[PDB]
Amino acid sequence: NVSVCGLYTYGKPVPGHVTVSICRKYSDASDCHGEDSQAFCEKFSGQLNSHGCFYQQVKTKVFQLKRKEYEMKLHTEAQIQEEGTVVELTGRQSSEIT
């Protein structure tokens, strides 16, 4: 359940939508594919609730929680409503190896 709510001034979120690049990643790539190193990029995007913080349920089955499926690298695509200057950045990206 990747729990996601940051507020641009701590008390003012949008009634909107958010997705996020939950991706199975971490395999040193030349980007010969033209796409980055994702073994998977999953999209459990949801509309941001007007009332309250928005939370998401992402199942790790389709994530394929496998031995030779490697660490993740995560880079949200957080979009802003009726402004168009949509946000993107790679934070919470350097995870661990179990």
Binding site: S27, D28, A29, S30, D31, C32, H33
Partner: protein
């Protein structure tokens, strides 16, 4: 030398011979292990040689 594909994808070499014993031939359009898309891992792309 340098040549370019006909409709069948063909060019027609011709090499004068009188030099060191062996000789290795390869014709190319794309470079030897290019720097962008080096490919040193799981990706699938290996251009013909």
């Amino acid at each position: 030398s340098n040549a370019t594909t006909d409709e069948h994808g063909l060019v027609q070499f011709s090499i004068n011979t009188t030099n060191v014993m062996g000789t290795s031939l390869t014709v190319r359009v794309n470079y030897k292990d290019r720097s962008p898309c080096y490919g040193y891992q799981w990706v699938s792309e290996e251009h013909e040689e």
